[PDB]
PDB file of C-alpha atoms in Angstrom:
ATOM      1  CA  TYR A   1      64.740   6.799  61.194  1.00  0.00           C
ATOM      2  CA  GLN A   2      62.130   9.026  59.553  1.00  0.00           C
ATOM      3  CA  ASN A   3      61.747  10.748  62.914  1.00  0.00           C
ATOM      4  CA  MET A   4      65.491  11.301  62.794  1.00  0.00           C
ATOM      5  CA  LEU A   5      64.760  12.288  59.181  1.00  0.00           C
ATOM      6  CA  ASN A   6      62.096  14.789  60.373  1.00  0.00           C
ATOM      7  CA  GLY A   7      59.577  13.254  57.990  1.00  0.00           C
ATOM      8  CA  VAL A   8      56.580  11.112  58.871  1.00  0.00           C
ATOM      9  CA  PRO A   9      58.040   9.112  61.801  1.00  0.00           C
ATOM     10  CA  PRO A  10      57.198   5.392  62.087  1.00  0.00           C
ATOM     11  CA  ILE A  11      58.785   4.251  65.377  1.00  0.00           C
ATOM     12  CA  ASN A  12      59.599   0.535  65.511  1.00  0.00           C
ATOM     13  CA  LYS A  13      57.792  -1.425  68.252  1.00  0.00           C
ATOM     14  CA  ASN A  14      58.397  -4.975  69.469  1.00  0.00           C
ATOM     15  CA  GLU A  15      56.076  -5.293  72.461  1.00  0.00           C
ATOM     16  CA  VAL A  16      54.359  -8.117  74.337  1.00  0.00           C
ATOM     17  CA  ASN A  17      51.687  -7.411  76.943  1.00  0.00           C
ATOM     18  CA  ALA A  18      50.435 -10.330  79.019  1.00  0.00           C
ATOM     19  CA  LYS A  19      49.744 -11.624  82.523  1.00  0.00           C
ATOM     20  CA  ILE A  20      51.433 -14.911  83.471  1.00  0.00           C
ATOM     21  CA  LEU A  21      52.312 -16.968  86.539  1.00  0.00           C
ATOM     22  CA  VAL A  22      55.894 -18.103  87.170  1.00  0.00           C
ATOM     23  CA  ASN A  23      57.955 -19.170  90.138  1.00  0.00           C
ATOM     24  CA  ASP A  24      60.709 -16.960  91.484  1.00  0.00           C
ATOM     25  CA  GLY A  25      63.549 -19.268  90.484  1.00  0.00           C
ATOM     26  CA  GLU A  26      62.053 -19.742  87.044  1.00  0.00           C
ATOM     27  CA  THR A  27      62.813 -18.203  83.674  1.00  0.00           C
ATOM     28  CA  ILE A  28      60.223 -18.299  80.922  1.00  0.00           C
ATOM     29  CA  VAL A  29      59.697 -17.203  77.356  1.00  0.00           C
ATOM     30  CA  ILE A  30      57.069 -14.493  77.639  1.00  0.00           C
ATOM     31  CA  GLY A  31      56.868 -14.371  73.865  1.00  0.00           C
ATOM     32  CA  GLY A  32      58.964 -15.044  70.826  1.00  0.00           C
ATOM     33  CA  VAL A  33      58.800 -14.528  67.093  1.00  0.00           C
ATOM     34  CA  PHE A  34      61.002 -15.914  64.339  1.00  0.00           C
ATOM     35  CA  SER A  35      60.868 -14.132  60.981  1.00  0.00           C
ATOM     36  CA  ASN A  36      62.224 -16.278  58.147  1.00  0.00           C
ATOM     37  CA  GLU A  37      62.465 -14.377  54.865  1.00  0.00           C
ATOM     38  CA  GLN A  38      63.495 -16.373  51.799  1.00  0.00           C
ATOM     39  CA  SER A  39      63.688 -14.355  48.603  1.00  0.00           C
ATOM     40  CA  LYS A  40      65.006 -15.582  45.272  1.00  0.00           C
ATOM     41  CA  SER A  41      65.063 -13.509  42.098  1.00  0.00           C
ATOM     42  CA  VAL A  42      66.659 -14.794  38.905  1.00  0.00           C
ATOM     43  CA  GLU A  43      66.732 -12.752  35.710  1.00  0.00           C
ATOM     44  CA  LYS A  44      67.527 -14.701  32.593  1.00  0.00           C
ATOM     45  CA  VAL A  45      67.738 -14.403  28.834  1.00  0.00           C
ATOM     46  CA  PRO A  46      65.898 -17.538  27.647  1.00  0.00           C
ATOM     47  CA  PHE A  47      68.349 -19.062  25.166  1.00  0.00           C
ATOM     48  CA  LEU A  48      71.578 -18.257  26.995  1.00  0.00           C
ATOM     49  CA  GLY A  49      69.874 -18.904  30.320  1.00  0.00           C
TER      50      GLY A  49
ATOM     51  CA  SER B   1      56.621  -0.108  63.352  1.00  0.00           C
ATOM     52  CA  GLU B   2      53.778   2.382  63.777  1.00  0.00           C
ATOM     53  CA  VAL B   3      53.539   4.846  60.953  1.00  0.00           C
ATOM     54  CA  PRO B   4      52.091   8.101  62.244  1.00  0.00           C
ATOM     55  CA  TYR B   5      49.736  10.434  60.428  1.00  0.00           C
ATOM     56  CA  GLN B   6      49.892  13.717  62.232  1.00  0.00           C
ATOM     57  CA  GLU B   7      46.512  15.177  61.540  1.00  0.00           C
ATOM     58  CA  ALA B   8      47.733  18.190  63.412  1.00  0.00           C
ATOM     59  CA  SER B   9      44.541  20.157  63.199  1.00  0.00           C
ATOM     60  CA  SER B  10      44.516  23.721  64.401  1.00  0.00           C
ATOM     61  CA  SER B  11      40.946  23.964  65.532  1.00  0.00           C
ATOM     62  CA  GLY B  12      40.526  21.518  68.332  1.00  0.00           C
ATOM     63  CA  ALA B  13      41.625  18.348  66.621  1.00  0.00           C
ATOM     64  CA  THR B  14      45.028  16.900  67.133  1.00  0.00           C
ATOM     65  CA  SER B  15      44.883  13.321  65.986  1.00  0.00           C
ATOM     66  CA  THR B  16      48.304  11.811  65.389  1.00  0.00           C
ATOM     67  CA  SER B  17      46.758   8.618  64.127  1.00  0.00           C
ATOM     68  CA  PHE B  18      49.302   5.913  64.194  1.00  0.00           C
ATOM     69  CA  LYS B  19      49.102   2.327  63.243  1.00  0.00           C
ATOM     70  CA  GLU B  20      51.808  -0.278  63.276  1.00  0.00           C
ATOM     71  CA  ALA B  21      52.620  -2.378  60.262  1.00  0.00           C
ATOM     72  CA  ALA B  22      53.740  -5.375  62.232  1.00  0.00           C
ATOM     73  CA  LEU B  23      53.415  -9.069  62.750  1.00  0.00           C
ATOM     74  CA  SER B  24      50.955  -9.328  65.583  1.00  0.00           C
ATOM     75  CA  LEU B  25      48.803 -11.718  67.568  1.00  0.00           C
ATOM     76  CA  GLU B  26      45.927 -10.629  69.786  1.00  0.00           C
ATOM     77  CA  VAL B  27      44.698 -13.706  71.632  1.00  0.00           C
ATOM     78  CA  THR B  28      41.832 -14.321  74.058  1.00  0.00           C
ATOM     79  CA  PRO B  29      42.018 -18.053  74.835  1.00  0.00           C
ATOM     80  CA  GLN B  30      39.378 -19.927  76.829  1.00  0.00           C
ATOM     81  CA  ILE B  31      40.577 -23.297  78.087  1.00  0.00           C
ATOM     82  CA  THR B  32      38.372 -26.388  78.149  1.00  0.00           C
ATOM     83  CA  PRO B  33      39.383 -29.353  80.351  1.00  0.00           C
ATOM     84  CA  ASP B  34      40.617 -31.711  77.652  1.00  0.00           C
ATOM     85  CA  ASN B  35      43.656 -29.578  76.810  1.00  0.00           C
ATOM     86  CA  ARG B  36      41.825 -27.583  74.157  1.00  0.00           C
ATOM     87  CA  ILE B  37      41.198 -23.879  73.718  1.00  0.00           C
ATOM     88  CA  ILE B  38      38.516 -21.838  72.046  1.00  0.00           C
ATOM     89  CA  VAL B  39      40.387 -18.615  71.384  1.00  0.00           C
ATOM     90  CA  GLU B  40      39.472 -15.366  69.701  1.00  0.00           C
ATOM     91  CA  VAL B  41      42.656 -14.390  67.885  1.00  0.00           C
ATOM     92  CA  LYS B  42      43.343 -11.515  65.525  1.00  0.00           C
ATOM     93  CA  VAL B  43      46.494 -12.331  63.543  1.00  0.00           C
ATOM     94  CA  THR B  44      47.797  -9.480  61.425  1.00  0.00           C
ATOM     95  CA  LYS B  45      50.826  -9.343  59.159  1.00  0.00           C
ATOM     96  CA  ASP B  46      51.133  -5.751  58.016  1.00  0.00           C
ATOM     97  CA  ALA B  47      54.075  -4.413  56.179  1.00  0.00           C
ATOM     98  CA  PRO B  48      55.071  -0.743  56.127  1.00  0.00           C
ATOM     99  CA  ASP B  49      53.828   0.957  53.008  1.00  0.00           C
TER     100      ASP B  49
ATOM    101  CA  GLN C   1      44.525 -16.512 102.914  1.00  0.00           C
ATOM    102  CA  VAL C   2      43.658 -16.875  99.221  1.00  0.00           C
ATOM    103  CA  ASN C   3      46.460 -15.874  96.882  1.00  0.00           C
ATOM    104  CA  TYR C   4      44.820 -17.138  93.679  1.00  0.00           C
ATOM    105  CA  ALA C   5      41.268 -16.194  94.699  1.00  0.00           C
ATOM    106  CA  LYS C   6      40.144 -12.611  95.184  1.00  0.00           C
ATOM    107  CA  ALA C   7      38.779 -12.033  98.684  1.00  0.00           C
ATOM    108  CA  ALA C   8      35.682 -10.292  97.292  1.00  0.00           C
ATOM    109  CA  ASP C   9      34.933 -13.413  95.276  1.00  0.00           C
ATOM    110  CA  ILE C  10      35.047 -15.428  98.491  1.00  0.00           C
ATOM    111  CA  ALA C  11      32.708 -12.898 100.057  1.00  0.00           C
ATOM    112  CA  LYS C  12      30.261 -13.493  97.213  1.00  0.00           C
ATOM    113  CA  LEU C  13      30.547 -17.228  97.805  1.00  0.00           C
ATOM    114  CA  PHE C  14      29.732 -16.699 101.473  1.00  0.00           C
ATOM    115  CA  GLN C  15      26.777 -14.553 100.428  1.00  0.00           C
ATOM    116  CA  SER C  16      25.628 -17.533  98.407  1.00  0.00           C
ATOM    117  CA  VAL C  17      26.135 -19.623 101.538  1.00  0.00           C
ATOM    118  CA  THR C  18      23.821 -17.198 103.320  1.00  0.00           C
ATOM    119  CA  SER C  19      21.364 -17.750 100.481  1.00  0.00           C
ATOM    120  CA  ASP C  20      21.543 -21.428 101.454  1.00  0.00           C
ATOM    121  CA  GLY C  21      20.139 -20.524 104.873  1.00  0.00           C
ATOM    122  CA  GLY C  22      28.049 -14.411 110.226  1.00  0.00           C
ATOM    123  CA  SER C  23      30.755 -11.759 109.941  1.00  0.00           C
ATOM    124  CA  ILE C  24      33.168 -11.463 107.007  1.00  0.00           C
ATOM    125  CA  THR C  25      36.347  -9.353 106.862  1.00  0.00           C
ATOM    126  CA  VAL C  26      38.401  -8.844 103.692  1.00  0.00           C
ATOM    127  CA  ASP C  27      42.138  -8.087 103.628  1.00  0.00           C
ATOM    128  CA  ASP C  28      43.217  -6.511 100.352  1.00  0.00           C
ATOM    129  CA  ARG C  29      46.915  -6.457 101.236  1.00  0.00           C
ATOM    130  CA  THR C  30      47.165 -10.210 101.784  1.00  0.00           C
ATOM    131  CA  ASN C  31      43.920 -11.091  99.956  1.00  0.00           C
ATOM    132  CA  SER C  32      43.034 -12.893 103.186  1.00  0.00           C
ATOM    133  CA  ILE C  33      39.498 -13.228 104.510  1.00  0.00           C
ATOM    134  CA  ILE C  34      38.803 -13.575 108.225  1.00  0.00           C
ATOM    135  CA  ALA C  35      35.325 -14.814 109.036  1.00  0.00           C
ATOM    136  CA  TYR C  36      33.783 -15.032 112.488  1.00  0.00           C
ATOM    137  CA  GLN C  37      30.703 -17.165 111.978  1.00  0.00           C
ATOM    138  CA  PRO C  38      29.266 -20.670 112.557  1.00  0.00           C
ATOM    139  CA  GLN C  39      31.814 -23.400 111.979  1.00  0.00           C
ATOM    140  CA  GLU C  40      29.770 -25.143 109.287  1.00  0.00           C
ATOM    141  CA  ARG C  41      29.602 -22.108 107.011  1.00  0.00           C
ATOM    142  CA  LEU C  42      33.282 -21.554 107.730  1.00  0.00           C
ATOM    143  CA  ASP C  43      34.196 -25.057 106.586  1.00  0.00           C
ATOM    144  CA  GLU C  44      32.025 -24.974 103.469  1.00  0.00           C
ATOM    145  CA  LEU C  45      33.482 -21.647 102.422  1.00  0.00           C
ATOM    146  CA  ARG C  46      36.949 -23.037 103.120  1.00  0.00           C
ATOM    147  CA  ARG C  47      36.322 -25.946 100.757  1.00  0.00           C
ATOM    148  CA  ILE C  48      35.155 -23.545  98.069  1.00  0.00           C
ATOM    149  CA  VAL C  49      38.243 -21.475  98.866  1.00  0.00           C
ATOM    150  CA  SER C  50      40.464 -24.487  98.285  1.00  0.00           C
ATOM    151  CA  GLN C  51      38.814 -25.201  94.948  1.00  0.00           C
ATOM    152  CA  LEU C  52      38.903 -21.557  93.829  1.00  0.00           C
ATOM    153  CA  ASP C  53      42.546 -20.870  94.754  1.00  0.00           C
ATOM    154  CA  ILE C  54      43.646 -22.716  91.622  1.00  0.00           C
ATOM    155  CA  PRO C  55      46.226 -21.288  89.190  1.00  0.00           C
ATOM    156  CA  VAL C  56      44.775 -19.952  85.957  1.00  0.00           C
ATOM    157  CA  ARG C  57      46.153 -21.928  83.021  1.00  0.00           C
ATOM    158  CA  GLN C  58      48.539 -20.073  80.715  1.00  0.00           C
ATOM    159  CA  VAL C  59      49.047 -21.325  77.162  1.00  0.00           C
ATOM    160  CA  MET C  60      51.829 -20.433  74.740  1.00  0.00           C
ATOM    161  CA  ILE C  61      50.272 -19.905  71.306  1.00  0.00           C
ATOM    162  CA  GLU C  62      52.629 -20.177  68.346  1.00  0.00           C
ATOM    163  CA  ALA C  63      51.118 -19.223  65.002  1.00  0.00           C
ATOM    164  CA  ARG C  64      53.212 -19.539  61.862  1.00  0.00           C
ATOM    165  CA  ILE C  65      52.741 -17.549  58.664  1.00  0.00           C
ATOM    166  CA  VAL C  66      53.913 -19.093  55.395  1.00  0.00           C
ATOM    167  CA  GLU C  67      53.884 -16.934  52.265  1.00  0.00           C
ATOM    168  CA  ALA C  68      55.149 -18.203  48.919  1.00  0.00           C
ATOM    169  CA  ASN C  69      55.048 -15.952  45.861  1.00  0.00           C
ATOM    170  CA  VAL C  70      56.338 -17.187  42.508  1.00  0.00           C
ATOM    171  CA  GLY C  71      56.417 -14.762  39.608  1.00  0.00           C
ATOM    172  CA  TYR C  72      57.450 -15.493  36.025  1.00  0.00           C
ATOM    173  CA  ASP C  73      57.153 -12.676  33.486  1.00  0.00           C
ATOM    174  CA  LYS C  74      58.456 -12.731  29.906  1.00  0.00           C
ATOM    175  CA  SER C  75      58.071  -9.928  27.344  1.00  0.00           C
ATOM    176  CA  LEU C  76      59.146  -9.924  23.689  1.00  0.00           C
ATOM    177  CA  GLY C  77      59.420  -6.808  21.516  1.00  0.00           C
ATOM    178  CA  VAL C  78      60.280  -7.754  17.920  1.00  0.00           C
ATOM    179  CA  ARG C  79      61.324  -4.968  15.549  1.00  0.00           C
ATOM    180  CA  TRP C  80      61.883  -5.093  11.793  1.00  0.00           C
ATOM    181  CA  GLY C  81      62.956  -1.630  10.701  1.00  0.00           C
ATOM    182  CA  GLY C  82      64.402  -0.564   7.391  1.00  0.00           C
ATOM    183  CA  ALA C  83      64.517   3.040   6.244  1.00  0.00           C
ATOM    184  CA  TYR C  84      66.015   2.064   2.883  1.00  0.00           C
ATOM    185  CA  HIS C  85      62.632   1.041   1.479  1.00  0.00           C
ATOM    186  CA  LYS C  86      60.666   2.597   4.387  1.00  0.00           C
ATOM    187  CA  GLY C  87      59.523  -0.697   5.906  1.00  0.00           C
ATOM    188  CA  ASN C  88      59.543  -0.539   9.722  1.00  0.00           C
ATOM    189  CA  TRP C  89      57.435  -2.478  12.228  1.00  0.00           C
TER     190      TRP C  89
ATOM    191  CA  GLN D   1      32.380 -27.184  85.925  1.00  0.00           C
ATOM    192  CA  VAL D   2      31.236 -26.076  82.463  1.00  0.00           C
ATOM    193  CA  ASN D   3      34.071 -25.166  80.127  1.00  0.00           C
ATOM    194  CA  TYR D   4      31.941 -24.826  76.980  1.00  0.00           C
ATOM    195  CA  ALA D   5      28.911 -23.341  78.757  1.00  0.00           C
ATOM    196  CA  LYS D   6      28.961 -19.949  80.440  1.00  0.00           C
ATOM    197  CA  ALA D   7      28.039 -20.195  84.119  1.00  0.00           C
ATOM    198  CA  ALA D   8      25.546 -17.326  83.786  1.00  0.00           C
ATOM    199  CA  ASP D   9      23.767 -19.295  81.078  1.00  0.00           C
ATOM    200  CA  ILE D  10      23.447 -22.199  83.501  1.00  0.00           C
ATOM    201  CA  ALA D  11      22.082 -19.784  86.077  1.00  0.00           C
ATOM    202  CA  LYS D  12      19.411 -18.735  83.588  1.00  0.00           C
ATOM    203  CA  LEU D  13      18.579 -22.391  83.007  1.00  0.00           C
ATOM    204  CA  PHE D  14      18.178 -22.885  86.747  1.00  0.00           C
ATOM    205  CA  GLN D  15      15.962 -19.801  86.837  1.00  0.00           C
ATOM    206  CA  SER D  16      13.846 -21.530  84.228  1.00  0.00           C
ATOM    207  CA  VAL D  17      13.870 -24.580  86.490  1.00  0.00           C
ATOM    208  CA  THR D  18      12.512 -22.337  89.235  1.00  0.00           C
ATOM    209  CA  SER D  19       9.843 -21.249  86.767  1.00  0.00           C
ATOM    210  CA  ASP D  20       8.951 -24.945  86.575  1.00  0.00           C
ATOM    211  CA  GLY D  21       8.086 -24.860  90.279  1.00  0.00           C
ATOM    212  CA  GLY D  22      17.776 -23.207  95.933  1.00  0.00           C
ATOM    213  CA  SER D  23      21.141 -21.442  96.035  1.00  0.00           C
ATOM    214  CA  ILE D  24      23.356 -20.870  92.989  1.00  0.00           C
ATOM    215  CA  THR D  25      27.015 -19.774  92.991  1.00  0.00           C
ATOM    216  CA  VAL D  26      28.939 -18.836  89.840  1.00  0.00           C
ATOM    217  CA  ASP D  27      32.718 -19.139  89.436  1.00  0.00           C
ATOM    218  CA  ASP D  28      34.036 -16.937  86.645  1.00  0.00           C
ATOM    219  CA  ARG D  29      37.620 -18.178  86.937  1.00  0.00           C
ATOM    220  CA  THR D  30      36.746 -21.823  86.313  1.00  0.00           C
ATOM    221  CA  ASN D  31      33.289 -21.147  84.819  1.00  0.00           C
ATOM    222  CA  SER D  32      32.081 -23.593  87.470  1.00  0.00           C
ATOM    223  CA  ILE D  33      28.692 -23.370  89.158  1.00  0.00           C
ATOM    224  CA  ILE D  34      28.139 -24.707  92.665  1.00  0.00           C
ATOM    225  CA  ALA D  35      24.503 -25.153  93.593  1.00  0.00           C
ATOM    226  CA  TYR D  36      23.169 -26.056  97.019  1.00  0.00           C
ATOM    227  CA  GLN D  37      19.559 -26.989  96.376  1.00  0.00           C
ATOM    228  CA  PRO D  38      17.161 -29.965  96.109  1.00  0.00           C
ATOM    229  CA  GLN D  39      18.720 -32.938  94.375  1.00  0.00           C
ATOM    230  CA  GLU D  40      16.090 -33.088  91.632  1.00  0.00           C
TER     231      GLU D  40
END
């Protein structure tokens, strides 16, 4: 986006580089990543809270 | 994503240094017979500044 | 023909066989080595070939990052200001 | 086959054995050393 913004451009890269053996009729997971973000923020006046 | 730093330097030095704030694994596994590995792994979780 | 074993590696093995005590040809395209030499060396190198042409073991490494940050911040500013008698904290 | 020991290290050990008083082959892929030499 910043490149589209003509600022300092951080391009976003998701890349896996590896050498593996598989058969022709075979599908594999070369790589995978699951990002689980859990954020909770509660703002509270003590007595009424 | 790889933030760039364009050290665009007029006199002979053009160093667009660029480094990705990313979740990353760099693995060099060595396998021992009993289904174990001694691996050199660099695991970096870097978030864009 | 050695698919999993580089032909040059086999050539080095045969060189070791020569060290034990003879023509070797290497095919890059097929990674296939043709050797015209005494049968015994042929057979020994073939056995080593069979052992060497073994698939390298891939492993799927799954590393999980768990970050938990808990932040509790409370601030109290208490003010007692009166300009009537000029008392203000 | 030595998984925990580098084959070259074993070759150096055999060289030391030669210093004590004979063909060595090193397999990088398996880290396995094949030696054709006296049994002892």
